[PDB]
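hey team, just a heads up i'm posting the complex here instead of the shared drive bc the drive is being weird again. everything in one block, sequence lines first with there labels, then the predicted structure for the whole assembly after. its two chains so it's a bit long, scroll down
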Amino acid sequence: KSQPLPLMRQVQIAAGGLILIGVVLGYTVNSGFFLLSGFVGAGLLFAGISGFSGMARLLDKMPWNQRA
Amino acid sequence: KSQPLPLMRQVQIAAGGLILIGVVLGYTVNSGFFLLSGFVGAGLLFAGISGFSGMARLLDKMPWNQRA
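-- predicted structure starts here --
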């Protein structure tokens, strides 16, 4: 039990990650087809929010005993 | 100096908030005009990630001495 695992972070990674993924595939499949093809935009966005959310979810509620 | 104010979260709230806002205004102004009008979607999304990111940014790097 390193961190108290609050809800001020889990909501950011959960809501931020999920929402992003969706709004991303949409903003790219609807507003991304104009830019280039629709993979670089939604793709780069997913990868970003992905690595970020992960690092945050760990620093907030790392899988310590999650896999003891 | 309550918290060390890391960057594992500051990146999620900063990048997540900014990106979300943009990807939202687009996914709604392009893929939202189909749903209803294009305000309920992008709007609810903005407010959501807004209050969330804020609560997180504060719980991590609250404006303690920021305005002492």
